[PDB]
Amino acid sequence: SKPQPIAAANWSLSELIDLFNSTSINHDVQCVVASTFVHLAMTKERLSHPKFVIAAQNAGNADALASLKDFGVNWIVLGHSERRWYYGETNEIVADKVAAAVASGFMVIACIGETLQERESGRTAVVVLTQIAAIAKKLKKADWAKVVIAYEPVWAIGTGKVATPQQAQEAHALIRSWVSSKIGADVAGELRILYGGSVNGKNARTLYQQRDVNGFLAGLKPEFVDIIKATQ
Ligand SMILES: CCCS(=O)(=O)CCC(=O)O
Numbered sequence: 050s051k052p053q054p055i056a057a058a059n060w061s062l063s064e065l066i067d068l069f070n071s072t073s074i075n076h077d078v079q080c081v082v083a084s085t086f087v088h089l090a091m092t093k094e095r096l097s098h099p100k101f102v103i104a105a106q107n108a109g110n111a112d113a114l115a116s117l118k119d120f121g122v123n124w125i126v127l128g129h130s131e132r133r134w135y136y137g138e139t140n141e142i143v144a145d146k147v148a149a150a151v152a153s154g155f156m157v158i159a160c161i162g163e164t165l166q167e168r169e170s171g172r173t174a175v176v177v178l179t180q181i182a183a184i185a186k187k188l189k190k191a192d193w194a195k196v197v198i199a200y201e202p203v204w205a206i207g208t209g210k211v212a213t214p215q216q217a218q219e220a221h222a223l224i225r226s227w228v229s230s231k232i233g234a235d236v237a238g239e240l241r242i243l244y245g246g247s248v249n250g251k252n253a254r255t256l257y258q259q260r261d262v263n264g265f266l267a268g269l270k271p272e273f274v275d276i277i278k279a280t281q
Contacts, residue, residue: 052239054257054280055197055264057081057104057158058273059126059245062088065269066095074100078280081158082269083126093121104158107132109146114153125150126266128160128184130203140183148187151195158197158243158266159184161224165204173202173220178227190233197241199266200224205246207268214259217244221261253279 056078074080083104084092093103104124105117117125127150128143138146143159150157161180163173177200188196200220205212212220221242229237244256245266253276256262267276 051263052241053077053079055079055081055158055241055243056273056277056280057083057126057199057243057264057266058269059106059129059266060084060088060269062091062269063095065271065273066092068271068274069096069101070098072098072274072277074098074277076281078264078277080277081124083124083158089120089122102156107146109142109149111149111153114150114155118153118155123154124156124158126158126160126199128180129199130160130162130201130206132160134164134203140180143180144183144187147184147196148192151188151192156195156197158199160199160201160245160266162199162201162203162206162246168202168204174223177220177224181224181227182231185228185232190236193228193232193236193240197243198224199243199245201245201266203246207247209247211247211249211252212244214255217256218259218261221259225261248276250275250279257281 080101081104083106102124105122106126127146132138147157147159161177163176167176225237241263243264243266248265248267250272
């Protein structure tokens with residue numbers, strides 16, 4: 050059966066926090082609010098729901114990680130689409146950031162995913178696996194307990210074009226199969242692989258039914274409540 054699912058929101062911020070705080074969540078699911086540096090302190094001050102944790106984003110400096118831990122931040126998102134396609138973080142830069150975060154005692158949501166052209170030319174597999182192999186090269190087996198994979202087709206991020214359940218399931222399954230082969234079937238079976246890209250209230254439920262979907266990464270928005278509820 051599936052490991053504990055995760056619903057993660059990538060960042061009015063005060064009214065959203067109010068709404069989350071008042072939300073009862075009956076089933077088992079880890080919720081994550083990933084905030085940019087400038088809004089971290091306020092989020093931690095305001096968000097008191099114990100099923101939620103706060104996540105930093107993109108920190109790559111040794112002292113920065115240290116300071117985040119000091120402040121009570123234990124989760125971090127790394128490798129998100131724009132980091133790669135705009136900021137210029139390579140597979141190896143992302144992988145180094147992930148190993149550093151794990152060494153500093155972070156839970157890590159590592160993002161991978163293919164471009165529109167890669168998808169169209171049928172190169173989704175080679176691309177996403179090259180990306181995860183770079184990450185895995187800097188980790189030891191035991192590290193995976195601290196790792197979560199977020200699969201996000203670049204063409205589905207903020208475009209309104211969601212992956213179909215078939216597309217998501219196929220991607221998730223090829224990722225899990227590679228992890229099974231290269232890392233261990235034990236690690237594979239416990240690994241959370243999340244889907245992201247145009248997830249909403251209407252489509253999340255159907256996506257979660259898929260065998261290899263363990264939750265979602267989505268925007269910080271009022272409908273995030275329904276995405277959380279769709280993780281069953
Ligand atoms: C405008 C963002 C829509 S979204 O759901 O595709 C965001 C996904 C993500 O930030 O990972």
